[PDB]
């Protein structure tokens, strides 16, 4: 830990991320073939001959049809939800999950994780430079609650203020500007040592990486990026950042008595393009999302 400008911190973080991605692309010498089967319901028996650690379930959807690319939000690699731009590794079986499936719980969780990550990206780059803004983590609140949340610790000078409606609308406008540019949710699986060396600064992120690499015997934590923002998240994410259609930030709340310092919780609600609600229903959801949600035990 030393003195570093946030801009140079982002540049060095991106450089390390790209170097790791390059070495992951490079340790495989030649193009290898995988026979990924389609265990879905609409196009059964379809096998794709894809490239190892190069091609993606979005590429499989491109082979199938354009509707698959448009509607498929998650993949299922033999048991598990994969984000749409994660290169495939072994000869597997695949199934595409959309927002209107019978059991869309996995895609709901992934969509809310993505929305929380976008909200954190908007928050980190919307405050004065001489305040220290640090992201603690995004609690894995359930969709049945009113909103997704992000925990942020601000510098000591801002332990007495509260953002007003204009500032909240500014946060929503930043979120919509982020939505307007189609940014893929790039993914990466790295080792614990590399994960620590990318961040190297925030003790909150350090303990987050420790907690996320302890339960894995291989000490691997997932890493995701939109544009030049990099966050640590649990579980996969949605392919594109324009999937969200309605996006807002509702309010921010404090939880002081659990720590000498102050941790704020930003809350927000979003609805995808496939599931847009009417003006009145969206107003109802907006009004509910302003309530504090406490699901951490």
């Amino acid at each position: 830990a030393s003195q570093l400008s946030p801009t140079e911190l982002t540049e060095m973080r991106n450089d390390l991320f790209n170097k790791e991605k390059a070495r992951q692309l490079s340790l495989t010498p030649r193009t290898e073939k995988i026979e990924v089967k389609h265990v879905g319901k609409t196009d059964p028996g379809t096998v794709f001959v894809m490239n190892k650690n190069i091609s993606t379930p979005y590429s499989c959807a491109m082979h199938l049809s354009e509707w698959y690319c448009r509607k498929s939000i998650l993949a299922l690699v033999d048991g598990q939800p994969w984000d749409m731009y994660k290169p495939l590794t072994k000869s597997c079986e695949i199934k595409f999950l959309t927002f209107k499936d019978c059991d869309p719980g996995e895609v709901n969780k992934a969509y809310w994780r993505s929305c929380a990550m976008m909200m954190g990206c908007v928050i980190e780059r919307a405050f004065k430079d001489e305040y220290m803004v640090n992201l603690v983590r995004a609690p894995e609140v359930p969709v049945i609650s009113g909103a997704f949340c992000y925990d942020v610790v601000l510098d000591s000078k801002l332990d007495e203020w509260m953002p007003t409606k204009e500032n909240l609308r500014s946060f929503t406008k930043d979120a919509h500007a982020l939505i307007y540019k189609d940014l893929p949710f790039e993914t990466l699986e790295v080792e614990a040592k590399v994960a620590l060396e990318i961040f190297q600064h925030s003790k909150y992120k350090v303990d987050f990486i420790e907690e996320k690499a302890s339960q894995n015997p291989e000490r691997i934590v997932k890493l995701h990026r939109i544009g030049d923002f990099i966050d640590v998240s649990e579980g996969p994410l949605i392919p594109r950042t324009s999937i969200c259609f309605q996006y807002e930030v509702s309010a921010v709340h404090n939880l002081q008595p659990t720590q000498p310092s102050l941790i704020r919780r930003f809350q927000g609600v979003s609805l995808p393009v496939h599931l847009r609600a009417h003006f009145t229903i969206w107003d109802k959801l907006l009004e509910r999302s302003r309530k504090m949600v406490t699901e951490d035990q």
Partner: protein, 132 residues
């Protein structure tokens, strides 16, 4: 290309009656909230002057009926029902044409699911059901 949509397209079998019930209750509560104009903050009430004109209303044509006068004559009448008539907005004398002030008045209540979004925002700010 974004497909069209209506209010109850993605709503579930159980969520449709809930949404209808909740929206109707909010509508009725908003309608009942305006029952006491003289207690909220009434605008000053001026005496009637000779060259003065007051506001009208929006009614609904119910039908026609016979009627008789004390001299035995018969006249046909038309029944006009005032369903939900409220004053919506008031423009100043100089803000429309400088000739006369204007009062906008709304008719019977309609559904919020089939109105323009700007109209919905206007009625949300006013705190009243939308008018036909």
């Amino acid at each position: 290309g974004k497909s069209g949509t209506w209010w109850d397209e993605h709503l579930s079998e159980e969520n449709v009656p809930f949404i209808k019930q909740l929206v109707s209750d909010e509508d009725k509560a908003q309608l009942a909230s305006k029952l006491c104009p003289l207690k909220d903050e009434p605008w000053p009430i001026h005496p009637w002057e000779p060259g003065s004109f007051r506001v009208g209303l929006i009614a609904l044509k119910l039908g026609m009926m016979p009627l008789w006068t004390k001299d035995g004559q018969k006249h046909v009448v038309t029944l006009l029902q005032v369903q939900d008539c409220h004053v919506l907005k008031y423009t100043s004398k100089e803000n429309c044409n400088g000739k006369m002030a204007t009062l906008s008045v709304g008719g019977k209540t309609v559904s919020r699911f089939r109105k323009a979004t700007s109209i919905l925002e206007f009625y949300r700010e006013l705190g009243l059901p939308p008018k036909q």
